[PDB]
Design a protein around this ligand. Structure first.
Ligand code: 3Q3
Length: 275
């Protein structure tokens, strides 16, 4: 392996993202002219706020992963005050931005991007890893417009996330499983099509109320096969969500009529439909 990298090895530029206890900064490595998204954390702050387990979890998970649809951790280093994680730079930023930009996806784009997310989760879950906070904000887009999923501090490795995407089991048990990610997937599909998350309200409490009641509905202009699929994912009983182990996994999920024209084997090699 190459020698440990250091801050002076890079020219730092603009801020790419702000976390609860971290900041992601675009950086160019001088020797290679390569661009990385460097996540910077203050050791003192992480210790003071008892965040060490989240930092460690993200490092350990983002290292075990080797798949095109996930942001990769290339290297780490530190100076007296800070930790630096060198991550893949996804030039086109957050999926959330594109949803806001174009309003709502047509069926061809919904299907392609939904398929990449499903394919990514199949990989992740096959490694016994659960994301636990999947959302448009951490589904990034590469220069090529393929997804790259990031933000793994909340992940769990098998032996409360963002309000709008929280699964019922978190609200009623404080427990999460692979199926929690599938619930998130259902919300994300709904949002790609409707342009809005399914569970919306004045505040967090009211959102949680709707979730545990499964109180939401489809606009008239919702692709019917997408609706059927969403209905098989947004299910209160976590053991009855399409894709989960008790439902026999990813086979039946990928075989859903909404994905009829999808070629699953090489999505990363296909050219994404123009947004
Ligand atoms: N790994 C990671 N990558 C990015 C990122 C952003 C832009 C990028 C680009 N343009 N290319 N690559 C990029 C990578 C951002 C990010 N988050 C920022 C938002 O907050 C999160 C947080 O605090 N999560 C949390 C909070 C508390 C506990 C556990 C987890 C952390 N995490």
């Amino acid at each position: 392996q190459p020698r440990k990298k250091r801050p002076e090895d890079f020219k730092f530029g603009k801020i790419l993202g702000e976390g609860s206890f971290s900041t992601v900064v675009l950086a160019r490595e001088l020797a290679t002219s390569r661009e990385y998204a460097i996540k910077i954390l203050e050791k003192r702050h992480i210790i003071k706020e008892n965040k060490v387990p989240y930092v460690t979890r993200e490092r350990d998970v983002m290292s075990r992963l080797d798949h095109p649809f996930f942001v990769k951790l290339y290297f780490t280093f530190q100076d007296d005050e800070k930790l630096y994680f060198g991550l893949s730079y996804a030039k086109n930023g957050e999926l959330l931005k594109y949803i806001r930009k174009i309003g709502s996806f047509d069926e061809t784009c919904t299907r392609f991007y939904t398929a990449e997310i499903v394919s990514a989760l199949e990989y992740l879950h096959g490694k016994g890893i659960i994301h636990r906070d999947l959302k448009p904000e951490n589904i990034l887009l590469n220069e090529d417009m393929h997804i790259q999923i990031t933000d793994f501090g909340t992940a769990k490795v098998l032996s409360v996330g963002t309000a709008q995407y929280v699964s019922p089991e978190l609200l009623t048990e404080k427990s999460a499983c692979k199926s929690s990610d599938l619930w998130a997937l259902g919300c994300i599909i709904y949002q790609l099509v409707a342009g809005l998350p399914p569970f919306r309200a004045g505040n967090e409490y009211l959102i949680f109320q709707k979730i545990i009641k499964l109180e939401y509905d489809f606009p008239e202009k919702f692709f019917p096969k997408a609706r059927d699929l969403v209905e098989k994912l947004l299910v209160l009983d976590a053991t009855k969500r399409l894709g989960c182990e008790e439902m026999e996994g990813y086979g039946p999920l990928k075989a859903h009529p909404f994905f009829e024209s999808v070629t699953w084997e090489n999505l990363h090699q296909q050219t994404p439909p123009k947004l």
